[PDB]
Amino acid sequence: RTADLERARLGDDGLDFQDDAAQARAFAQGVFLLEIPEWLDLSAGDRFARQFFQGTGVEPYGKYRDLSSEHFGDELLGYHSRVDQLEQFLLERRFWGEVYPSEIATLGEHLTLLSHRVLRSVLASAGIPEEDWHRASGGCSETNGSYHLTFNHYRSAHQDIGLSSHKDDGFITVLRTTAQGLEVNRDDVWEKVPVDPACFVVNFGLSMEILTSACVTPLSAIMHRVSHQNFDRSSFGHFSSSRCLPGADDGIYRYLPSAGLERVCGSRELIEENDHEIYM
Numbered sequence: 001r002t003a004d005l006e007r008a009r010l011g012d013d014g015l016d017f018q019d020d021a022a023q024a025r026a027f028a029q030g031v032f033l034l035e036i037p038e039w040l041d042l043s044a045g046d047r048f049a050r051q052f053f054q055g056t057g058v059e060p061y062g063k064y065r066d067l068s069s070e071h072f073g074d075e076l077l078g079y080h081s082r083v084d085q086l087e088q089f090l091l092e093r094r095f096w097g098e099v100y101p102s103e104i105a106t107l108g109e110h111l112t113l114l115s116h117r118v119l120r121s122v123l124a125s126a127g128i129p130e131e132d133w134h135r136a137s138g139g140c141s142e143t144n145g146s147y148h149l150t151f152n153h154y155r156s157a158h159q160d161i162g163l164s165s166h167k168d169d170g171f172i173t174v175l176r177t178t179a180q181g182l183e184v185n186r187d188d189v190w191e192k193v194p195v196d197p198a199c200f201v202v203n204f205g206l207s208m209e210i211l212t213s214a215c216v217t218p219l220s221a222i223m224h225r226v227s228h229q230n231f232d233r234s235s236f237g238h239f240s241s242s243r244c245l246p247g248a249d250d251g252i253y254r255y256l257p258s259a260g261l262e263r264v265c266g267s268r269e270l271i272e273e274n275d276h277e278i279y280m
């Protein structure tokens with residue numbers, strides 16, 4: 001079975017769904033489709049996702065295979081081979097200008113500002129006072145969050161699930177996928193996410209679920225996975241998290257209606273605990 005998702009577009013007033021009920025369903029499901037702006041070139045990102053794992057013999061992006069987590073002082077970044085079919089290149093915004101090719105950093109900036117606009121629509125729909133958005137979002141209601149532009153390749157020769165079931169860590173994931181494999185578990189049945197290369201997939205992460213757990217319409221971090229791939233597959237995603245630097249962590253908060261924000265845990269703590277549960 002395949003999920004019937006709502007489609008939205010960024011317009012003059014923010015996220016535009018077909019109607020208010022459609023937006024309600026999309027937000028309650030925790031996953032929806034977002035039209036890719038026509039001016040936005042994704043071809044360099046798509047090529048990077050197809051090449052990053054192939055090593056320095058493959059121009060212009062294969063060389064990023066050689067950049068392991070040590071080159072960054074942050075074990076989460078660089079090239080990672082996972083226990084599932086997936087292998088990844090992960091890089092946080094603070095390194096894009098220095099480390100990514102210039103056109104890949106440009107892509108990451110476009111996606112940051114786009115995700116910024118998406119997140120502020122969601123925050124307004126949740127009824128959180130505007131002056132709490134910055135702390136509630138760890139800077140992502142502006143542009144001071146932590147942002148990962150992450151590229152994925154599924155090694156079909158590996159006899160694993162493509163990517164185990166998990167929820168994302170942060171507030172918003174903007175996912176660029178062009179092939180089948182992504183599945184979501186809204187309402188206790190797994191469903192394929194329909195493929196539409198003219199749309200991003202948008203879903204919420206654990207920090208959105210924590211943030212809104214006490215609101216009148218709590219939003220959920222959708223459980224999703226990538227089924228076992230018989231041929232190779234690639235994708236990439238822009239992930240927005242509470243500012244989670246090694247030295248400067250913005251914290252994870254739950255909004256208490258009529259009271260304010262209360263601290264739950266750290267942003268890096270959440271990413272580490274989540275990343276443990278997925279792969280072990």
Ligand SMILES: CC[C@H](C)[C@@H]1NC(=O)[C@H](C[C@@](C)(O)CO)NC1=O
Pocket residue numbers: 076082088090148149150166167168169170239241271278
């Ligand atoms: C360090 C992860 C970063 C915060 C971000 N947050 C996610 O939740 C996913 C995690 C995943 C499943 O892609 C790792 O394999 N990706 C990302 O880039």
Ligand SMILES: O=C(O)CCC(=O)C(=O)O
Pocket residue numbers: 150152163168175177181182224226234235236237
């Ligand atoms: O490759 C995909 O479609 C999903 C990737 C993903 O869910 C992730 O990296 O967290």
Ligand SMILES: [Fe+2]
Pocket residue numbers: 166167168224
């Ligand atoms: Fe994910």
